Scaffold this motif. Sequence first.
Motif, PDB file in Angstrom:
ATOM      1  N   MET A 259      -0.539   9.047  14.550  1.00 40.22           N
ATOM      2  CA  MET A 259      -1.468   9.607  13.577  1.00 40.22           C
ATOM      3  C   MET A 259      -1.341   8.816  12.282  1.00 40.22           C
ATOM      4  O   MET A 259      -0.314   8.187  12.030  1.00 40.22           O
ATOM      5  CB  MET A 259      -1.130  11.075  13.297  1.00 40.22           C
ATOM      6  CG  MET A 259      -2.131  11.793  12.394  1.00 40.22           C
ATOM      7  SD  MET A 259      -1.615  13.457  11.895  1.00 40.22           S
ATOM      8  CE  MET A 259      -0.712  13.981  13.340  1.00 40.22           C
ATOM      9  N   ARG A 260      -2.395   8.838  11.475  1.00 41.13           N
ATOM     10  CA  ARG A 260      -2.380   8.153  10.191  1.00 41.13           C
ATOM     11  C   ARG A 260      -2.866   9.139   9.141  1.00 41.13           C
ATOM     12  O   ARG A 260      -3.685  10.012   9.426  1.00 41.13           O
ATOM     13  CB  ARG A 260      -3.310   6.939  10.187  1.00 41.13           C
ATOM     14  CG  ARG A 260      -3.170   6.012  11.376  1.00 41.13           C
ATOM     15  CD  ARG A 260      -3.989   4.752  11.153  1.00 41.13           C
ATOM     16  NE  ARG A 260      -3.317   3.839  10.230  1.00 41.13           N
ATOM     17  CZ  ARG A 260      -3.914   2.835   9.595  1.00 41.13           C
ATOM     18  NH1 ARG A 260      -5.211   2.611   9.771  1.00 41.13           N
ATOM     19  NH2 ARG A 260      -3.212   2.046   8.796  1.00 41.13           N
ATOM     20  N   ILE A 261      -2.349   8.997   7.928  1.00 44.26           N
ATOM     21  CA  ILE A 261      -2.741   9.850   6.820  1.00 44.26           C
ATOM     22  C   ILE A 261      -3.405   8.948   5.793  1.00 44.26           C
ATOM     23  O   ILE A 261      -2.762   8.065   5.226  1.00 44.26           O
ATOM     24  CB  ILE A 261      -1.518  10.522   6.175  1.00 44.26           C
ATOM     25  CG1 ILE A 261      -0.774  11.347   7.225  1.00 44.26           C
ATOM     26  CG2 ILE A 261      -1.959  11.382   4.989  1.00 44.26           C
ATOM     27  CD1 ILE A 261       0.601  11.794   6.791  1.00 44.26           C
ATOM     28  N   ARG A 262      -4.699   9.156   5.571  1.00 43.37           N
ATOM     29  CA  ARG A 262      -5.428   8.347   4.606  1.00 43.37           C
ATOM     30  C   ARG A 262      -5.106   8.798   3.186  1.00 43.37           C
ATOM     31  O   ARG A 262      -5.148   9.991   2.878  1.00 43.37           O
ATOM     32  CB  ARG A 262      -6.938   8.445   4.863  1.00 43.37           C
ATOM     33  CG  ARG A 262      -7.798   7.547   3.972  1.00 43.37           C
ATOM     34  CD  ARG A 262      -7.326   6.099   4.031  1.00 43.37           C
ATOM     35  NE  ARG A 262      -8.193   5.183   3.292  1.00 43.37           N
ATOM     36  CZ  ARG A 262      -9.316   4.660   3.774  1.00 43.37           C
ATOM     37  NH1 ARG A 262      -9.719   4.959   5.002  1.00 43.37           N
ATOM     38  NH2 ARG A 262     -10.033   3.829   3.031  1.00 43.37           N
ATOM     39  N   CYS A 263      -4.758   7.837   2.336  1.00 44.36           N
ATOM     40  CA  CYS A 263      -4.445   8.113   0.937  1.00 44.36           C
ATOM     41  C   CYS A 263      -5.606   7.620   0.096  1.00 44.36           C
ATOM     42  O   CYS A 263      -6.288   6.676   0.477  1.00 44.36           O
ATOM     43  CB  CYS A 263      -3.207   7.345   0.475  1.00 44.36           C
ATOM     44  SG  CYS A 263      -1.708   7.611   1.411  1.00 44.36           S
ATOM     45  N   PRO A 264      -5.833   8.245  -1.069  1.00 47.65           N
ATOM     46  CA  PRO A 264      -6.925   7.839  -1.959  1.00 47.65           C
ATOM     47  C   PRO A 264      -6.501   6.654  -2.832  1.00 47.65           C
ATOM     48  O   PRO A 264      -6.811   6.598  -4.021  1.00 47.65           O
ATOM     49  CB  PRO A 264      -7.188   9.103  -2.767  1.00 47.65           C
ATOM     50  CG  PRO A 264      -5.816   9.679  -2.915  1.00 47.65           C
ATOM     51  CD  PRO A 264      -5.216   9.502  -1.530  1.00 47.65           C
ATOM     52  N   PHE A 265      -5.775   5.721  -2.221  1.00 46.83           N
ATOM     53  CA  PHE A 265      -5.285   4.515  -2.884  1.00 46.83           C
ATOM     54  C   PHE A 265      -4.756   3.582  -1.805  1.00 46.83           C
ATOM     55  O   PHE A 265      -4.340   4.022  -0.735  1.00 46.83           O
ATOM     56  CB  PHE A 265      -4.206   4.849  -3.930  1.00 46.83           C
ATOM     57  CG  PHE A 265      -3.241   5.915  -3.502  1.00 46.83           C
ATOM     58  CD1 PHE A 265      -2.201   5.628  -2.628  1.00 46.83           C
ATOM     59  CD2 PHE A 265      -3.377   7.215  -3.981  1.00 46.83           C
ATOM     60  CE1 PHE A 265      -1.305   6.621  -2.236  1.00 46.83           C
ATOM     61  CE2 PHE A 265      -2.489   8.215  -3.595  1.00 46.83           C
ATOM     62  CZ  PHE A 265      -1.450   7.918  -2.720  1.00 46.83           C
ATOM     63  N   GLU A 266      -4.773   2.288  -2.089  1.00 50.08           N
ATOM     64  CA  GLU A 266      -4.374   1.285  -1.113  1.00 50.08           C
ATOM     65  C   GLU A 266      -2.887   0.999  -0.962  1.00 50.08           C
ATOM     66  O   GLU A 266      -2.446   0.533   0.094  1.00 50.08           O
ATOM     67  CB  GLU A 266      -5.103  -0.026  -1.438  1.00 50.08           C
ATOM     68  CG  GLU A 266      -4.763  -1.205  -0.543  1.00 50.08           C
ATOM     69  CD  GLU A 266      -5.461  -2.479  -0.985  1.00 50.08           C
ATOM     70  OE1 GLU A 266      -5.195  -2.942  -2.115  1.00 50.08           O
ATOM     71  OE2 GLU A 266      -6.275  -3.017  -0.205  1.00 50.08           O
ATOM     72  N   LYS A 267      -2.109   1.299  -1.995  1.00 50.83           N
ATOM     73  CA  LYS A 267      -0.697   0.967  -1.958  1.00 50.83           C
ATOM     74  C   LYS A 267       0.365   2.051  -2.026  1.00 50.83           C
ATOM     75  O   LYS A 267       1.123   2.123  -2.995  1.00 50.83           O
ATOM     76  CB  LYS A 267      -0.412  -0.066  -3.046  1.00 50.83           C
ATOM     77  CG  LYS A 267      -1.256  -1.322  -2.913  1.00 50.83           C
ATOM     78  CD  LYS A 267      -1.064  -2.240  -4.104  1.00 50.83           C
ATOM     79  CE  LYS A 267      -1.907  -3.497  -3.964  1.00 50.83           C
ATOM     80  NZ  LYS A 267      -1.726  -4.410  -5.124  1.00 50.83           N
ATOM     81  N   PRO A 268       0.428   2.923  -1.009  1.00 50.09           N
ATOM     82  CA  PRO A 268       1.471   3.951  -1.063  1.00 50.09           C
ATOM     83  C   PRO A 268       2.784   3.168  -0.968  1.00 50.09           C
ATOM     84  O   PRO A 268       2.893   2.229  -0.174  1.00 50.09           O
ATOM     85  CB  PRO A 268       1.200   4.785   0.185  1.00 50.09           C
ATOM     86  CG  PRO A 268       0.565   3.796   1.132  1.00 50.09           C
ATOM     87  CD  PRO A 268      -0.376   3.043   0.218  1.00 50.09           C
TER      88      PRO A 268
END
Length: 312
Positions: A259-268
């Motif tokens: 599974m993947r968790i989309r973040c509202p930014f490119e660089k967690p």
Amino acid sequence: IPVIEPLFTKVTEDIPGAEGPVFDKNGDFYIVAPEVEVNGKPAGEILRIDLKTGKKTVICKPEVNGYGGIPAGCQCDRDANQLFVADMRLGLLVVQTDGTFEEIAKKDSEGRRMQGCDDCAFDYEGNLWITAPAGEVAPADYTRSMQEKFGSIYCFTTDGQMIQVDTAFQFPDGIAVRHMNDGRPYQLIVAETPTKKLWSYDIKGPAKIENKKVWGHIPGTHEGGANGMDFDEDNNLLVANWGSSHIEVFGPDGGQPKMRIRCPFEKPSNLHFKPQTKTIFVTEHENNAVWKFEWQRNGKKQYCETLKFGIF
Ligand SMILES: [Ca+2]
Ligand SMILES: [Ca+2]
């Protein structure tokens, strides 16, 4: 691969190189700002964030003999409410809540000069596994293993030994320890950023790892890769995939993310669970800020959440 998009809530901002989110034994929250500089020189900071208001306070701006630190990762101790901080310039530090700190080692158990550290993970036996992607600590000129394989792995043991347990990594970054349900440490996971790999080792005992294996594969060909990581209570490994806009979720057996968790930014860059909750705090470098979101379950208890005494 299924992707979920939970709501991310802002926690705090303007944290240069936002990294190493961690909770201490009192539930207070801290993060590090490794990239703060003064006159072009390292002046990294360790901050406490008041979860209400989002007010920031710099409790420690580590420097050894004029050499500023680049604090990058943290773990809270169990027997004392103090933070063990991996510093890319100073190695391993032990920081008190009052802001005072100590440098743990200039050399390892074999007399070799210590390398700058990035992240660390305490196993339940109290041993600290550390990634060291930087070259020798200050006063040595700063170097990083993003191109050359000179990154190492250490185990700072309960009996005070800083033991190098492996070497030749191309920027070892995140690190985590998997435990048997009975609490016995048995697997070490290490992220090698640019190679898009997660390596595993069997933990045979304190500072004893064997059977190095390519355990997981980080998606994407983007610049970056696996940064920080942590286990949830079911032993799924959540990994910040710097540059991919996602946090990858690996099942207990590794391989490809389930599974993947989309973040509202490119660089967690890193993440950490708030004790007794499903809340994951995430640091990121697109905005150099900290956020939080709700995961599907509680996190795996950190060493600082376990009891030295008690009965069970
Ligand atoms: Ca890191
Ligand atoms: Ca963490």
